[PDB]
Design a protein around this ligand. Sequence first.
Ligand code: HEM
Ligand SMILES: [Ca+2]
Ligand SMILES: [Ca+2]
Ligand SMILES: [Mg+2]
Ligand SMILES: [Mg+2]
Ligand SMILES: [Mg+2]
Ligand SMILES: [Mn+2]
Length: 331
Amino acid sequence: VTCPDGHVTANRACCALFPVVQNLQENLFDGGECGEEAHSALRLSFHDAIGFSLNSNKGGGADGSILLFNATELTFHANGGIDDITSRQFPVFETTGLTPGDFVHLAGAVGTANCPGAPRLQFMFGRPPPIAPAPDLTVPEPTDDVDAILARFADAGFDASEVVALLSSHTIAAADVVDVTIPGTPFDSTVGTFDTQVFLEVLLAGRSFPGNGSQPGEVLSPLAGEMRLQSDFVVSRDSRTACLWQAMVNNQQLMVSSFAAAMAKLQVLGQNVNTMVDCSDVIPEPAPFAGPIKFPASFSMADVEQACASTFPQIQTVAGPAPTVAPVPGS
Ligand code: HEM
Ligand SMILES: [Ca+2]
Ligand SMILES: [Ca+2]
Ligand SMILES: [Mg+2]
Ligand SMILES: [Mg+2]
Ligand SMILES: [Mg+2]
Ligand SMILES: [Mn+2]
């Protein structure tokens, strides 16, 4: 099929999406950047989709409920920071004609593709409008323990392997509301790169808080300007998840493959995949990221708090002063 747009595709139903993706890239992602809006779109995709249970009715999953029922879902504590994300998305969404769910999930996949090293995520298309808001408490909190995290994910259909896979997202992530004095504080020292740096950096001994001291949801971090979530800390070190976490360190392909597979499930939670169309070809091709990660300057294996009995990966050390991580620019 040649779309009237000129683009070629497997299914005519995907033709609408080529202009939408251009709209996103220009008017949401500032010309296809791995910046605030791209990171935000991935976070929104997770918040929308996790409003789902295999067992009980905890929402329609990846239905775009978090947009259509924005007023309700933005009242929930774990959706802190989401208002800024949806506020910025709405002007773009409004000119697309898409269901809220197809828009949220497309934007999350396109945004991810803007980050060097990221997978080109599967994009299934065809999410009917949402019927109801998710209830409260579907989204994990950074103060949650591993029991609670693993329980919530399992309820939605994800095992421990998949939880670690999905936390790869924190390689391109910053916090705006855990400490409102330091918006845009990243979780790793390569917030514009979809690499395995966050898996290493969370394993370093934490030494300081990045902003206005101790705030609920964070723990001591190893670098000035870097935030460490309490949830990432406990998942990295718990016996159920530690080997999974360590395996990601300096293993770019394991991270990307694991993440790609888990995201393909996440982004269709609640949906009837047999009634959807494969429109994966509308997602931009991401820039590659091969070479290895390295320790931040001044650190070494002495500073790693190794939580798994497997031999730790060999990672190059860098001579120099400990680095300061810059905040992410607001837009
Ligand atoms: C235990 C599970 C999780 C917890 C407790 C958690 C918690 C957090 C917190 C507290 C923030 C900072 C929010 C703010 O202050 O603005 C954040 C950011 C983010 N999270 Fe997670 N998260 C989890 C899982 C995930 C998953 C599964 C994804 C996607 C697959 C995701 C993607 C992101 C992204 C992309 C950001 C960055 C947003 C930005 O830079 O604007 N998270 N997360
Ligand atoms: Ca939802
Ligand atoms: Ca990174
Ligand atoms: Mg383990
Ligand atoms: Mg290992
Ligand atoms: Mg911007
Ligand atoms: Mn943000």
